[PDB]
Structures are given as C-alpha cells and as structure tokens.
C-alpha cells in the first residue's frame, strides 16, 4: 500500500472552498388539530403550526376526502400579519438556534392564541366559537407597565382573558381584556444586584433549565372554583427558589470593551443547589373580572419535611379537574424518583403575626397530606421525561395514570397505575416528623402496557397521545430498530400486540392529533432529506384495536438528495464488551486502488445522544462529507453511553466517564481498518465538541499510538468545575467517587499529554457560561508547567454554541487547515 496525500490549499483558497460549498442552504413544528365542525364544509380539521427567513404561525386546511390518484400538497396560509439577556441565555438553555416565535399557547373553548414575538407578548383568536378566518390576523399586543422584558407567558386555562408571565423573576397576571395588571409575587427586587438578592418566584433555576430541560416554574390550575357572590378563584402553583447559598461564578461580559464580568449562579458539583420550595397564589375575582384580592400561600410545614429527601422539582402541573396539583421529584443522587399529589389544602396564607399563623395551621386537617402515588429506584439513574398522563377521577379514593419507567425492565416502557389515596398514618396535630413511609400510597394495579428489549421515547418532545375513548395509547419507540424512531399504538386495558404505524426504512418524529384521528411525521433517512407528511388513521368496524394508516397529504416535500453529498454507510460490529456497537463511515470520494487515506474520527459518544442512526446527515453534519471529498476517511462511533439502547448500556460509564469510551472508538476503527485496506491508521485524527472535546483530549492522553492529532472543542478538563444536575447523575458527589473524578479529569493528568507539538488543538467559546473557559485556561496552566505544547484558538463572541456566522466560518476554515497541515497533506507527514 501507498499513502494518499490531500491537496495543500492555502488559507484564502480553503475559505473560497468552504464559502462555495456553503453557498446553497428548518421544518414546521408545534402542530395542533382543531375541528372545523362544518356539516356542509369541505374541510374536517384545521391545523396550526410554526414555520420559517423568520418563524411564524401558519395554518393549513384539512379536507374530508382526497383524490387518491394525486398527491395533495397542503398549502400554507399564514395566521399572522406583519435581544435581551433573559432571552439570549434561555435560547442557549433551550438550544434554539433560529429567531422568531419559539412556541405558543392556545385555549380550546375561546380560540385565544398567546405567544411572545420579540420583546412583545401577543394574542390572536381563531378556531373557537368566533370562527375561522380566511386572511392573516393582526397580532394584539398585550400592554404593560412593566419596565423590563416579560418571560414565559401562559394562558390561564380556566379564564382565557387572564394570562401570567415572569417579570424580573416575579409572577404577574395581565388581563387581555380589562387590561388589569398585578404583581403576584414580591420576591426579587429588580434594582438590587444579584450578589445580595438571589430569591426568585415562578422561574426555573439554571440547573433545571440546563440539565433537566425544564424551562418554567409556575403552573396555572386548569379549573376555577366559584365564589358565593358570583366571582371565581383562580390559582397559580409556583416554585420559589432561594439561590442565596449557591456559588457565584464570573463569566466574561460579551461587550469585551467593558472588560467586566457578569456574576451568575452556578451550582458547582458537590456544592449546594438552591433552596427550592412550593407555593401557590389564590387570585380571587368578582363577576366583573376585577381582582378582589390576591392571597399568597405557603406549605403548612417546610419542604424539607413534607418532601423528605427531595433535592429537585423535575416536573409539575395539575390533575385534569384541578383537584390536586402533582409533582415529579428526584432525590439528589437522582436514583429515587417520586410522583406526589399536593392538595391546595396543604397551603395556608403567609402570616407575619405569630398567633394567627398558629390558628391557621390548626384549621388545616391532619388528613390533608402529600400523597406519594409512585416511587421508583435504581442503581444507575432516573432519566426524566415529559410522559405522564392522569385519567379523570372515576373513584374519589383513587387515581389512574400512565407513566414511563426505565427502572423495571432495564429499558423504558409504559405502565398503567391505579394508586389508592389512603388517609396517612402520620397526624401533624401530635407534632412530629413523618416516618420514611408515612406518605406512601398503596399501588392497586400496575399493568405494564409495553415491554421488551427496546425503549419508549419521552425526551425532546416525544410523548404519548392517549385515546381515552378507544382506550389506546400512541408513542414513538425503538422497537423496530435502534437506528429508527417509529410510531406505535396499543391498548392500555388489554396490553398485547403493538402496531407500528410509521413506514420502515425511515426515522419519524410524529405529532398525533388531539382527537387521535390523524398524525404528522417528519421523516428522513441517510439518503433522503426530511419530508413532512400527514397521515389519517382508521379503526375497522369489527376491531377498534387495529388502527390502520393512509397517507393523506404532504405538508413539506423534501429538497431531494443534495447534489455533491455522498452519504455515509451505517456499519456495526460485535464488541468485545458484548454489544452490537453501531458506527457511520464516510469513504473518501473517488477512491483509489492501492492507496491508504488519512482518517478523521468525529465523536461525541456521551449521555443523552445518538449520532449513529438512520437520518439525513447533510444538514448539520454536512462537513463530514466535505472532509471526505477532500480525501479523509471519516468515522463516527457510538461508544457505550449513547442513548436509545437501554439503561444498562448507557450506565456502563457511571462513576467512570472518559475511561471506557476510546476503547470502543479504537475497537471500531480497528474492525474497520482490517476490512478497509484504504484506512491509514498511522494518520488518525479525532475531534468533537463538549463531551466530544472531552474524549478527543482523552484519546490523545491515553492513545498517542492510535491518534496523531486531537481537536478539543469546549471540553471538560475538570469535573470539580461542572454542575450538580449532570455530574452527580453520572459520577456522584466527588467524595463518593474520589478516583473516578481524578481519572475522568484530563487537566489533573497534564503530564500524560504528548511532548510532540502539532497534535493538541484547543477550541473554546470565551463567554462559555456552561463549560466555563477556565476548563481550557487551567488545562493550559498545568500543560504549561508540565512542559507540554498546545495550539489554541478562542472564539470571543461565543458560548456553549457558535452563533455569529463569521465565528463558525473561522472554526471550519481553521479545523480544515489544521487537519490538512498536520494530518492529511504530504507536508504534514514530512514534519514528523
């Protein structure tokens, strides 16, 4: 064999290349099905959705029949007629790259939409009693006396005139009709600096937004209780955080000319999280919709007693009929989940006068108590999801609900549960701390809906749509393959045959109608881009379990296979570790016989993430293919730790992060290198971002033999610097894993790095709030004093993201030039 050398292009030339391949370049989302209720009309439903180059509410008409010779192309009608810190941070937390309207709220009975475009909060009406428009609607600005920006606006389900929002970390409730506005929480003074003012109501802490993808801390109660005179009592449940005790970090201010730092709260691993607790506002109203009064209530006992051991409010909300408010609750180590009903009778008014408090406590019965309706444990971890469905209350002594759990089988499946709401043994009157089991409820039934060596999908907007009429439950899953996410359906009363609805060979992300008679699917594969098509469901007269599917219309046709993009082929191997580890291979374009090629290995292979599966890798992973075309082999492997393959697989690196990963990357690279005589193993490079950059550094530290060069992007060089929500989940408290932390921290092992230059390259966003720049700066400090070289590049306008276009152009240009000059080209192998 003979080595192939890629073409030495100049910096200016490589920029022309990357400029021109870029020269030609998001689908719709947040669908909602609203019935037209037109006896005489052609259309059954009307769908609404957000689409993009701005991002606005569209609608499209759904016809009762279709011509089955032709493809109905659904036409897009626009519903709408034409940065703060609180936004730009949230946009980082939500990982939302594109500007416009990120989401919206809607009230069924009225028709009221509610959404936040720019600084403004707006509302429009369509779909309700007030009809269906045939032209764009002009957005109604919700007006305010609030100085700063307003976040997280939500329609009250009970009265759609009222809305709430956050303002300077406090809750407010403007009325879209009376224009009455009121501050419901007086917890945080907007003027007083953060160092001495850390309380905040209705908001999700940094950790809950970053690590538990929960972006809100208040939940409107769906029903309104009537008053004697004629008004009504609304309710908002909220989380009151006190971040007083949490660490204060300094991250560089984006305005580099100021040369100052923003102080924000970062629960470093092993330190304390904020002092969370529950609370509830009782908004009293008269018949006129005027606010009579607002009583603000608190738990009858501390949160540390009633929810003993709870360190996180992962999710929360209300039961369908507003009777109890519920809450999903993790212990600190995140191995013990709970599901706790919380009666509004637990909350009593706040009182300064000491003997009025005393009185109010005794008016509350002993029988009122937190009802823990489910508890689960594990020796790996809970993965929080959005799945939870509570059925209406059949019997007043019980609560039927569906939930998902990895904890039973080792894989995530659906379980129907009836819990019995027992009067708790514990009686507050006697005065004492409840026993470890005093609030637990008996489980009457627990019927596993699904089961097997595959998982149901709950993260990232996958959920369940439950048909409470036919008594079915729809769900995405990995049953047909780990590489394809498909829609399924099954009875929740007589569990049995699961029925796949989506077509084989693709990876779908469905959004089933609230009426369960339709479902949309954004699908693609390795070859084709992502079409979005509508599909109609049908029960045969003789058998409601059997749902059959028929293509109805196309919402968005695919572009078609991109010209000048050879996709990769999706390989596997039997691992020495007893698993079928999957990988992706970009063969170099226009291969030569008898010539070995320089190999680049892209990587992430960390938790919550699969890279290797059947989807179009032309959008985001475009350059992997541009690389290949220039003459690099490109490999991608999902080491043990990747998602969508069960808990025990994901758990393999627990307490052990960075120690098992490269073993699999090399394993697959060697399995490949035997079969593929064109793979030059002497010239392997590696590169990734975040956990990717972490492993790239590990790769070079451990396996100088396999990897010639490593390019680490915003890497974790030190676990004592990351946050609680993540590191404790996967590595635990630093005292309970003294040795895993040290082995998993590359900056502690700086002397292990290679004394050859032109091998380590560090990239980092300088304003990185998440993976703080310190990680790089301290790695460098210890490198400097261990006497090892590095090449560094900083992206000063950036965070845990690349958002400025010219910053991303530079990253790409440089990485290619670096790869050329130190791996691929003939001058690179000369240097050695």
């Amino acid at each position: 064999l003979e080595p192939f050398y890629v073409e030495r292009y100049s910096w200016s030339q490589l920029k022309k290349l990357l400029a021109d391949t870029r020269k030609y370049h998001k689908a719709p989302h947040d669908f909602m099905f609203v019935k037209r209720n037109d006896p005489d009309g052609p259309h059954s439903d009307r769908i609404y959705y957000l689409a993009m180059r701005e991002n606005t509410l569209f609608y499209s008409e759904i016809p009762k029949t279709i011509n089955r010779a032709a493809v109905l192309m659904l036409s897009w009608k626009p519903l709408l007629d034409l940065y703060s810190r609180e936004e730009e941070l949230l946009r980082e937390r939500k990982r939302i790259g594109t500007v416009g309207i990120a989401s919206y709220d809607y009230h069924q009975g009225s028709g009221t939409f509610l959404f936040q475009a720019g600084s403004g909060i707006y509302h429009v009406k369509d779909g309700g009693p007030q009809g269906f428009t045939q032209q764009p609607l002009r957005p109604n600005l919700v007006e305010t006396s609030c100085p700063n920006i307003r976040m997280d606006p939500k329609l009250c389900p009970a009265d759609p005139d009222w809305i709430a929002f956050i303002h300077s970390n406090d809750i407010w409730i403007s009325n879209i009709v009376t224009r009455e506005e009121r501050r419901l929480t007086y917890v945080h003074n907007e003027l007083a600096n953060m160092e001495e003012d850390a309380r905040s109501a209705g908001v999700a802490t940094f950790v809950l937004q970053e690590e538990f993808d929960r972006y809100s801390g208040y939940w409107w109660c769906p029903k309104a209780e009537t008053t004697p005179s004629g008004g009504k009592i609304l309710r908002i449940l909220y989380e009151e955080n006190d971040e007083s005790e949490v660490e204060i970090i300094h991250v560089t201010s984006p305005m580099l000319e100021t040369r100052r730092a923003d102080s924000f709260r970062y629960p470093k691993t092993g330190t304390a999280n904020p002092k969370v607790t529950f609370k509830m506002s009782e908004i009293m109203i008269d018949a006129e919709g005027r606010i009579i009064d607002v009583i603000d209530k608190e738990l009858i006992q501390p949160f540390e007693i009633l929810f003993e051991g709870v360190e996180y409010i992962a999710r929360a909300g209300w039961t369908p009929e507003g009777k109890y408010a519920w809450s999903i609750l993790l212990d600190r180590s995140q191995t013990r989940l709970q599901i706790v009903l919380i009666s509004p009778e637990l909350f009593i008014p706040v009182e300064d006068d000491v003997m009025e408090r005393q009185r109010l406590i005794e008016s509350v019965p002993d029988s009122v108590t937190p009802l823990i309706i489910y508890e689960e444990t594990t020796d790996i971890w809970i993965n929080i999801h959005d799945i939870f469905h509570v059925f209406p209350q059949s019997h007043e002594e019980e609560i039927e609900f569906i939930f998902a759990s990895e904890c039973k089988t080792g894989f995530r499946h659906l379980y129907k549960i009836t819990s019995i709401l027992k009067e708790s043994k514990y009686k507050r009157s006697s005065g004492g701390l409840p026993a470890p089991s005093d609030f637990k409820c008996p489980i009457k039934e627990e019927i596993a809906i699904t089961s097997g060596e595959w998982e149901v999908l709950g993260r990232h907007g996958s959920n369940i749509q439950v048909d409470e009429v036919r008594r079915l439950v729809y769900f995405e899953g990995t049953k047909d393959s780990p590489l394809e996410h498909h829609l399924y359906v099954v009875s929740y009363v007589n569990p049995g045959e699961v029925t796949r609805l989506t077509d084989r060979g693709y990876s779908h992300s469905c959004c089933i109608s609230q009426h369960c008679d339709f479902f949309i699917s954004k699908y693609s594969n390795q070859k084709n881009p992502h079409c979005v098509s509508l599909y109609k469901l049908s029960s045969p007269e003789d058998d409601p379990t059997c749902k059959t599917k028929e293509f109805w219309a196309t919402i968005l046709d695919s572009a078609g296979p991109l010209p000048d993009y050879t996709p990769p082929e999706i390989f596997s191997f039997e691992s020495t570790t007893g698993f079928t580890l999957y990988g992706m291979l970009y063969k170099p374009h226009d291969l030569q016989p008898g010539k070995k090629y320089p190999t680049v290995l892209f990587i992430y292979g960390g938790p919550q993430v699969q890279l290797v599966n059947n989807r179009f890798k032309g959008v985001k992973y475009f350059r992997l293919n541009t690389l290949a075309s220039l003459g690099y082999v490109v490999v991608v492997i999902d080491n043990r730790g990747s998602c969508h393959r069960g808990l025990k697989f994901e758990g393999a690196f627990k307490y052990k992060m960075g120690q098992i990963e490269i073993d699999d990357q090399v394993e697959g690279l060697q399995y490949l290198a035997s079969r593929y005589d064109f793979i030059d193993l002497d010239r392997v490079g590696i590169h990734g971002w975040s956990y990717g950059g972490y492993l790239s550094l590990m790769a070079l530290m451990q396996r100088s033999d396999i990897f010639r060069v490593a390019i680490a992007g915003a890497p974790v060089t030190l676990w004592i610097f990351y946050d609680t929500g993540y590191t404790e989940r996967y590595m635990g408290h630093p005292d309970q894993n003294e040795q895993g932390y040290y082995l998993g921290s590359v900056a502690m092992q700086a002397e292990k790095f290679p004394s050859e230059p032109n091998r380590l390259l560090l990239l980092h966003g300088f304003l990185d709030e998440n993976v703080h720049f310190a990680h790089t700066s301290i790695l460098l400090s210890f490198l400097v004093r261990a006497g090892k070289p590095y090449d560094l590049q900083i992206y000063p306008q950036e965070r845990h993201s690349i958002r400025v276009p010219e910053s991303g152009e530079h990253y790409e240009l440089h990485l290619l030039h670096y790869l050329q000059e130190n791996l691929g080209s003939r001058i690179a192998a000369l240097k050695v």
């Binding site: 971002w689 992007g713 690349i802 790409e812």
Partner: peptide, 8 residues
Amino acid sequence: SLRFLYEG
C-alpha cells in the same frame, strides 16, 4: 447537557 450548538 454537555452539548454544543453549531449548525453549518
């Protein structure tokens, strides 16, 4: 997460 956001 430990998860960046670039979109080329």
